[PDB]
Amino acid sequence: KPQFPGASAEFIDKLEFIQPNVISGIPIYRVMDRQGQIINPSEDPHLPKEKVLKLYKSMTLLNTMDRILYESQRQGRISFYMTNYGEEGTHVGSAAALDNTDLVFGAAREAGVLMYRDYPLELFMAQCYGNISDLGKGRQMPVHYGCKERHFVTISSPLATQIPQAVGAAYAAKRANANRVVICYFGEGAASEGDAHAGFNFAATLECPIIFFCRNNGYAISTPTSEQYRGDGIAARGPGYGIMSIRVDGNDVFAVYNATKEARRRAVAENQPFLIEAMTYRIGHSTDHPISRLRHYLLSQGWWDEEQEKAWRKQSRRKVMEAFEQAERKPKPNPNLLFSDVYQEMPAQLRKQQESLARHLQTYGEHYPLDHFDK
Amino acid sequence: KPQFPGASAEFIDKLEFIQPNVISGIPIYRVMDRQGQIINPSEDPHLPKEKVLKLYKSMTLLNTMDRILYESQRQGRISFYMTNYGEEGTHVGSAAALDNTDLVFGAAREAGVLMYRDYPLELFMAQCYGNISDLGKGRQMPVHYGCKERHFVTISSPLATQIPQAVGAAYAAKRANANRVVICYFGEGAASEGDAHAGFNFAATLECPIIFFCRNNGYAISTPTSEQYRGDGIAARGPGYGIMSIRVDGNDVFAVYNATKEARRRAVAENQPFLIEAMTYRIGHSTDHPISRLRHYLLSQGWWDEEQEKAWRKQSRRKVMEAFEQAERKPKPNPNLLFSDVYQEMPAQLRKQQESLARHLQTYGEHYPLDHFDK
Amino acid sequence: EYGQTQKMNLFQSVTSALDNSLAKDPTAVIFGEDVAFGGVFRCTVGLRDKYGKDRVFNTPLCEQGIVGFGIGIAVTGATAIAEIQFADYIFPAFDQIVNEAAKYRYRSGDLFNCGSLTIRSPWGCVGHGALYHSQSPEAFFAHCPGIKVVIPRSPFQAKGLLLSCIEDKNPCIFFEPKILYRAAAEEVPIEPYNIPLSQAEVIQEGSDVTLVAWGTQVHVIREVASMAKEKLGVSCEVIDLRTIIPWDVDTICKSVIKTGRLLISHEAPLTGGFASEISSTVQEECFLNLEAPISRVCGYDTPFPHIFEPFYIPDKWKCYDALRKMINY
Amino acid sequence: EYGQTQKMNLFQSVTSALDNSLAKDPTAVIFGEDVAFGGVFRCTVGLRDKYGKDRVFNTPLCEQGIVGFGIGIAVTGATAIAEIQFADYIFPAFDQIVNEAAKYRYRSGDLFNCGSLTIRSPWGCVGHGALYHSQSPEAFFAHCPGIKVVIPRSPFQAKGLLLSCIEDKNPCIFFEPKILYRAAAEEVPIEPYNIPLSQAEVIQEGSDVTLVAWGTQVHVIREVASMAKEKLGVSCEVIDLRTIIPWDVDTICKSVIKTGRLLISHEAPLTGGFASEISSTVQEECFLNLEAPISRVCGYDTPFPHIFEPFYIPDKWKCYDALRKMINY
Ligand SMILES: Cc1ncc(C[n+]2csc(CCOP(=O)(O)OP(=O)(O)O)c2C)c(N)n1
Ligand SMILES: Cc1ncc(C[n+]2csc(CCOP(=O)(O)OP(=O)(O)O)c2C)c(N)n1
Ligand SMILES: [Cl-]
Ligand SMILES: [Cl-]
Ligand SMILES: [K+]
Ligand SMILES: [K+]
Ligand SMILES: [K+]
Ligand SMILES: [K+]
Ligand SMILES: [Mn+2]
Ligand SMILES: [Mn+2]
């Protein structure tokens, strides 16, 4: 009986403010308990052994790499690092639910997605060292990864800027009849940025095949969520934009996989956004765990044991150390590369600046650390 | 039993996405029907005759001013105008519920708030004409009003920028132990801007005494709300930020007053934000009506009639035309005033630019429209 | 020389460029506030009916979203033509332009880019626009390596420069002087053609002084050249810069080596304005040829006023007086 | 001359300024991301425990909100000291700074203002910060009438300039060179004192050439002056600009009239950089005194690189070589 274009609603004849439900919020979806036991048989994805072992080995290999590169940072061998501790389950559980060619936008804390997609150890290292093997040409801070082959858009420091971008790539995919979905990861702190409000609204009104994947680890650097928002986390925001939303246990690789798998299926079929808020806890910020929960599961199915755990711990340390040795011995790229790719074609005036550097180094090069730069 | 810091919730053992309720949204609060009849006696504010007549005369005087200045714009006597048609009830109903000294931030479509606060006709006109009586010194586009005496912060064109500002003034008021509330008006289109997400979240986490007043008229220039958002209007967004929220019939001056009155009482007592979404329809954008509904009400109480309507229509036309004649005959401010107030004190280099203009006009002044500029 | 032409004003020339782009590039889409019905300056009239609602569409009212979304379309390789409704309102998107779009190719080692993005926006004074309908923000963007900024002076120039921006493999901001949208028409080819970026145009040869401007201000300096010839017997070389970055240093310096005197004019405020970059560069390259100090005749260092506009703008009398003093130095 | 001093590094001097401000101005509050526990560069250590959670507090992670909120506090007359965690991340707030804060007093006819707002933010290169931990955005803000932009070179200068910004009746951006936060301490008065805005400081008199810089780059040009004296027998006048806008035109021009030669240096990219404004202004005012072209030795026109930082920055060898050529012109 109300006729207003802005909303579809009835009249009410008494004044009643709508109260938020924060104390009893959106419940947390969980598939396996802390002992790795399946709680509800109808929800078990019954992933095959080789796939569940890949989830496990990807998480642990990431953890092995993290320990070594974190030490490398402490010694000043690389200028920065930040670990994935506690996030390994959200990474690998969601990546396993995607198509290989689904495009990923991330925030900075999803090396496990690249790991699941078989990104070489040499290439994680090359970016952290800024060596000649880095396809990023040593230009970004360490732990800024990207891979065009594996459909993983280069990560950038400014928080949340990837969120409206991811929506545009999803709109483009829709037009291309891609049958592809975009996933976009961000933390609960980044969800406070204006660009998150932009991306969430655009994806709904432009009907885009996108999964918004918020990792809520309770902290943004020193800021607890009590200072970050006052509604019921990020999941409760989704319905206000018209977005189907769910909250999952981010320490449960199966809950993450199931929610991501179903979000992907429906996003691609229906051209509509889905929001998944995965609850974790930031175990490490920069320079009841998903791995142990999955280990307990494996040890039930009879698919892992102490002998295997020992051998894999050895093999993964050896692979990480081989990559690390190679990364440290590679030279850095030619200093000329600081000038290319600013535009596709270097402007004549930028070429002039390049030439001026080359002249400068001719005369003053003894003063520059040219030892381990290429050419 | 979940222990995550980011949310307070139970576990759930089955995958269920949370669906938005858009088809049956937040209901629309209404006090009087289209014939001006009170629907629910317990909700009648029983405002006294002199106050209800002030609501009526403020709305109609605004409408009289609007018709004349809109004509003035069509003739090129002023460079721009935009009317308040259909919004008069939201303006005056909310302003009547505020304290005189509550601070107002607006969007551009709330001249009725200044009208209710007894802003002189001469001063609305002076701003539209950019004449010497304008305390804005003729610097802004017409229909950009401000009044420090009446606690109405100067309106600016960029949409939604006032929303986080209003929250900061409310935080400051809280500290000052003001017992004052800030109100901040914006349209449903402006609510798509990033600054709206900023203001709504900050007001909740910093516990600010602020009323967010969204006018939802179904359109932002040519854009219908179907292209603006896909959730249940703006009211449904409030709970996601932890904000108490309500939707009202913006054509019903009593529903607007009651919701604003109760939001103000609770915002100031509890230091918490309130969101009111008033549903209207944009009758006019720039260069079942609130007035007729209130007229029907008056005509019931026996408080108005055709004789009074005629006399007031005459008196208000005369007052508007007196102000209009005066506004047109005033000179514009001295061109020197284009340089002051850029900083509190004019920088010596800016003074030099002022002096250069003065020299220029000495030599070339015949070429400038100096006729009706002061000095 | 370019096939059949019609008289087009500058809004019509923009529609023509956009129509030609849609026709020949099936990936291209146009989006922004109020573009579906044809736009608040009529630049997209007819395009949605002609090309489809999926290709010409309205966004929510959120400039940071508009640009971020356009970047995302371009990351997939599709042509993204975003509109910002007035250049005054581009600032919400400044972080997506400067920190994201401009740095996208460099920071990924060319693994990703958003070269197929163009942002177009009405620009410059309009008589009564005051603070937020009048701005010329090009100097803010000029200090950002990785973007191109382009400003035409006429309908012919607009269509040819806009087509080049849309086709350029770098994110481009195209500023359309709004006071020219319905001003005099001129003949514009109906079919596509390009004018090169980073190339100034000498529109009148002269031997005594070089005058440089862009957008509407080109017409002001053309009139100044006429006043100078008639009143002073002074020969002015008149140059339209066209591309603000990367700019055509060589064309400007070659002219100043010849004339020995340079006056640059723009509506934007003096301090930090792009004339500051041209003057300091010409000074470095042409020092020994300079007969008089390089002159900058610009808006004052204030916000852009409503009632005082006729006194604020660097008009032909302000430019002429500056020129007169420079000739007499 | 200013009472008791202690050795303070630059972060400690900022804490000292902020503590003095809180103590003497009961309206003042400090807010931003992670300021409560003391900040990611320790600039707010101890202040919340000392002054209260209502006065030193964390905001949500939203720069446009931080600035908008700070504007709102200042509209009521209360002192608002907002922090942006790295200057690279100030761009989300560019529209609130340029369209709102800078224009607030002018556009209301002085009915309202936000003069009691200061935005402080870490700034400049740090060895390995790459694209988003290294930026020096001052030229973007220099083209905005209505804001002041201030950059100190040392702990003493920082505390005195920050107190002046906090007390100035105009919205001010105070950029703190982060590579100096834990570098050498110097003696800093414990009690409040002020250094004037829009005033350059000649820190070494000289007669052959004027060198101008700000922030860390002041120490680079001081070392260049030493290299010039020792290697070339050249006397350099070394000037710290301190305030980018409104800048001290008179101090710079008076020096260039004396020496006849000017070299300006900054870490920001060359094109559109603030050296462009200084050079073109000095050229206009000191034309007849100029013995050689004014030199600008700046970062290259690229984003700021990680591994190539030592090759990107306008270091003492780059400045010295430029100076050598200028002396030989
Ligand atoms: C626009 C912007 N502001 C500030 C920062 C500095 N910063 C880097 S991480 C971070 C906290 C991020 O929190 P969240 O989004 O929750 O991610 P998490 O680190 O918890 O995974 C901040 C403030 C940034 N990178 N970008
Ligand atoms: C940042 C910005 N973008 C664009 C505009 C141009 N504009 C002026 S009004 C308007 C529609 C506003 O819609 P809404 O907020 O619903 O208010 P209404 O006009 O319906 O009252 C637009 C896009 C603006 N003023 N500011
Ligand atoms: Cl990071
Ligand atoms: Cl407006
Ligand atoms: K990012
Ligand atoms: K506004
Ligand atoms: K392009
Ligand atoms: K200040
Ligand atoms: Mn977090
Ligand atoms: Mn509207």
Instruction: Convert B158-201 into a string of H (helix), E (strand) and C (coil).
Output: CCCCHHHHHHHHHHHHHHHCCCCCEEEEEECCHHHCHHHHHHHH
A302: alpha, beta or left? (left if phi > 0; alpha if psi -120 to 50) = left
Can you tell me the distance from the alpha carbon of B242 to that of B204, in angstroms, rounded to the nearest whole number? 6
| Sign, Cα dihedral of B175, B177, B179, B180 | negative
- Please list, in sequence order, all residues whose beta carbon lies within 8 angstroms of the beta carbon of residue C51, skipping any fewer than 6 positions away: C22
Q: How far apart are CA A66 and CA A112, in angstroms?
A: 11
CB contact at 8 A, D268 and D170: no
Cα-Cα-Cα-Cα dihedral sign, residues A137, A142, A144, A148: positive
- Kindly provide the b/e burial profile for residues A199-215, where b requires at least 16 CB atoms within 10 angstroms of the residue's own CB: bbbbbbbbbbbbbbbbb
- Is residue D186 part of the annotated active site? The answer reads no
Q: What angle do CA B149, B153, B156 make, to 5 degrees?
A: 145
Among B13, B225, B262, whose Cβ lies nearest the Cβ of A6? Answer: B225
Q: Which among B208, B132, B139, B134 is positioned nearest to B168, based on CA atoms? A: B208
Q: Can you tell me the distance from the alpha carbon of C73 to that of C115, in angstroms, rounded to the nearest whole number?
A: 10
* Contact call for residues D291 and D329 (beta carbons, < 8 A): yes
β-bridge partners, C185? none
Distance CA B68, CA B62 (A): 10
A 10 A CB-CB count for A149 gives 10
C305 vs B139, B157, B221: nearest CB: B139
What are the structural domains, with CATH classification, of chain A?
A: 1-375 (3.40.50.970)
Residue A46: how many CB atoms within 10 A of its CB? 8
The best mutation among A81, A216, A221, A281 to test binding of ligand 1, ranked by most ligand atoms within 8 Å of the C-beta, falls on: A221
> Which CATH architecture fits C201-325?
3-Layer(aba) Sandwich (3.40)
One-letter amino acid for residue B299 of the chain: L
The CA–CA distances, whole Å, from B182 to B90, C61, C99, D244 equal: 16, 24, 35, 36
C-alpha span between A226 and A185 (Å, rounded)? 21
Tokens 């994110």 sit on residue: C171
Those residues with Cβ within 8 angstroms of residue B65's Cβ, 6 or more apart along the chain or in another chain: B111, B121, B124, B320
May I ask the CATH class of domain D4-200? alpha beta
Cα–Cα nearest to C241, from C309, C139, C100, C170: C139
What does the alpha-carbon distance between residue B109 and residue B333 come to, in Å, rounded to a whole number?
26
Which helix (H) or strand (E) element contains residue D15?
Answer: helix D10-24
User: Cα separation of C76 and C97, whole Å?
Assistant: 17
Exposure on the CB side of residue C243, measured as CA atoms within 13 A: 24
DSSP string, C264-304: EEEEEESTT-THHHHHHHHHHHHGGG-SSPPEEEEE-SSPP
CA dist C21 and C2 (Å) reads 17
Instruction: Dig out the tokens for B293 from the structure.
Output: 């509904």
Residues 6+ apart with CB under 8 A from A352: none
B192: its two tokens: 């798509």
Give the span between the Cα atoms of D210 and D259, in whole angstroms.
Answer: 6
Residue A79, SS3 per DSSP: coil
D247/A306 Cα distance (integer angstroms): 70
Q: How far is ligand 3, taken at its centre, from the CA of residue D246, in Å?
A: 34
Asked if C105 and A204 touch (Cβ cutoff 8 Å), the reply is no
**Residue B154 DSSP one-character state:** P
Torsion sign across C-alpha atoms D264, D266, D268, D270: positive
CA A320 remoteness from chain centre: 21
Query: Among A79, A109, A72, which Cα is nearest to A94's?
Result: A109
Instruction: Tokens 């918020």: give the residue.
Output: A214
Nearest CA in chain C to D102: C303
List, in sequence order, every beta strand (DSSP E) within C178-234.
186-189, 201-204, 209-213
The span from the CA of A265 to the CA of A90, in Å, is: 18
For residues A340 and A350, give the distance between their C-alpha atoms in angstroms, rounded to a whole number: 9
Cβ–Cβ under 8 Å, residues B151 and B72: no
Take residue C58 and report the two structure tokens written for it. 């309205």
Q: Best substitution site from B186, B213, B221 to test ligand 2's pocket, by max atoms within 8 Å of Cβ?
A: B221
Instruction: List gaps in chain B by the residue before each (C–N > 2.5 Å).
Output: 284, 287
CA separation, residue B146 to residues B59, B65, B126, C59 (Å): 19, 17, 12, 31
DSSP string, B314-373: HHHHHHHHHHHHHHHHSPBPPGGGGSTTSSSSPPHHHHHHHHHHHHHHHHHGGGS-GGGB
Residue C115 vs residues C66, C103, D259: alpha-carbon distances, Å: 16, 11, 47
Instruction: Indicate the resolution in Å.
Output: 1.7
Q: Which three-class secondary structure state does DSSP give residue C210?
A: strand
Backbone angles phi, psi at A324, to 5 degrees: -60, -50
User: Which among C304, C297, C285, C244 is positioned nearest to D272, based on CA atoms?
Assistant: C244
Exposed, middle or buried, B358 (CB in 10 Å: 0-12/13-18/19+)? exposed
- Compute the distance between CA of residue B106 and CA of residue B127 in angstroms, rounded to an integer: 16
Rounded CA separation D318/D326 (Å): 12
Cβ neighbours, 10 Å, residue D7: 11
Angle made by CA atoms A355, A361, A362, in degrees to the nearest 5: 90
D29 to each of A222, D82, D83, D148, D283, how far by Cα in Å?
19, 8, 11, 20, 43
Buried b (16+ CB within 10 A) or exposed e, C204-230: eebebbbbbbbbbbbbbbbebbebbee
Ligand 1 atom with least separation from CA of A87 = 21
Which residues of B touch chain C, with CB atoms under 8 Å apart?
79-80, 130, 138-142, 144, 156-159, 189-190, 192-195, 220-223, 227-229, 332-333, 335, 337-339, 342, 347, 349-350, 353, 357, 360-361, 363-364, 367-369
Helices A290-301 and A253-270 sit at what angle, rounded to 10 degrees? 100
Cβ–Cβ < 8 Å for A175, C54: yes
Sign of CA dihedral D185, D187, D190, D194: negative
Percentages of chain A per state (helix, strand, coil), in multiples of 5: 45, 10, 40
Which residues have CB under 6 Å of ligand 1?
A 109, 157-159, 187-190, 215, 217, 219-221, 282, 285; D 33, 61, 63, 85, 89
Chain C contacts of A172, Cβ < 8 Å?
Answer: 27, 72-73, 76-78
Enumerate residues 67 to 86 of chain D having a beta carbon within 8 A of any beta carbon in chain B: 67-78, 80
Secondary structure of residue A99 in the 3-state scheme: coil
Going by C-alpha positions, the residue among C304, C311, C302, C206 that lies closest to residue C263 is C206
**DSSP strands (E only) in chain B:** 11-12, 28-29, 103-105, 182-187, 210-216, 219-220, 223-224, 244-249, 274-279
Using CA atoms, how far apart are residues B296 and B303, in angstroms rounded to an integer?
A: 10
Same CATH fold, D201-325 and D4-200? yes
Strand locations in C161-303 (E): 172-177, 186-189, 201-204, 209-213, 236-240, 243-245, 262-269, 295-299
Q: What is the Cα–Cα distance from B237 to B20, expressed in whole angstroms?
A: 11
Beta bridge partners of B105: B184
Question: Helix, strand, coil proportions of chain D in percent (round to 5)?
Answer: 40, 20, 40
| Beta bridge pairs of residue A186 | A214
Phi-psi region of D210 (alpha: psi -120 to 50; beta: other; left: phi over 0): beta
CA atoms within 13 A on the CB side of A33: 8
Q: In whole angstroms, what is the distance from residue C326 CA to residue B58 CA?
A: 59
Q: Which amino acid is at B197?
A: H
Q: Extract the tokens encoding C147.
A: 């973007």
Burial, B165: exposed, middle or buried (Cβ in 10 Å; 0-12, 13-18, 19+)? Answer: buried
Domain spans, chain D: 4-200, 201-325
CB C241 within 8 A of CB C271: no
